[PDB]
Design a protein around this nucleic acid. Structure first.
Length: 85
DNA sequence: CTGCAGGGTTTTTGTACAGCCAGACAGTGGAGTACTACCACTGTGTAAGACAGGCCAGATC
DNA sequence: CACAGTGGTAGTACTCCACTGTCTGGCTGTACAAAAACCCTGCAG
DNA sequence: GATCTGGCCTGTCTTA
């Protein structure tokens, strides 16, 4: 991912950290093939709910993510309390 | 005094002649001009407290 | 789904150096009017 | 002897 180790988490390294690529690069590390599925699907959920708050006005630029936010966060929370509990 | 109406005033606003210089037009073949994405990649978020469990110290009986 | 940068490049695009004629727009003397905006004075309430 | 409380020291978390 071409990302140096860090002192403090800055928002820039925080934008290059959560992307599907970064996760699929750290997917090679964890041997369990169930977990790959889990954290990977987790990250995709997060990418889906991120533009909701981070975009200036979600009502226009990202409406379909917005309407799905509650349900999406639901799958997310259920995934944490289930697998990562 | 107000109202409008002939004309005054001076001054605008342009058209009237006629000659003439300037720079735009258009060509070119391409010059080398100027302004363009594009490329990874960055800088600014910076210190305390709360809370759980241990367990030893030491007062109280 | 920050943002305002950061220099070199290759891209593109535009706009320039000579040869020429031709064109419109614009200036100069006074003459000639018609508008421009007062203030007059004139005639009326 | 042995409680309770507070202690420090650790010891993790969360924001910064």
């Amino acid at each position: 991912m071409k990302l140096k180790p860090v002192m403090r988490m800055n928002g820039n390294y925080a934008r290059r950290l959560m992307t599907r690529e970064a996760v699929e690069a750290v997917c090679e590390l964890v041997p369990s093939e169930e977990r790959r599925e889990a954290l990977l699907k987790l990250m995709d959920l997060y990418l889906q709910m991120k533009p909701v708050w981070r975009s200036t006005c979600p009502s226009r630029d990202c409406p379909d993510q917005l309407c799905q936010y509650s349900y999406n966060s639901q799958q997310f929370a259920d995934l944490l309390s289930s697998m990562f509990k």
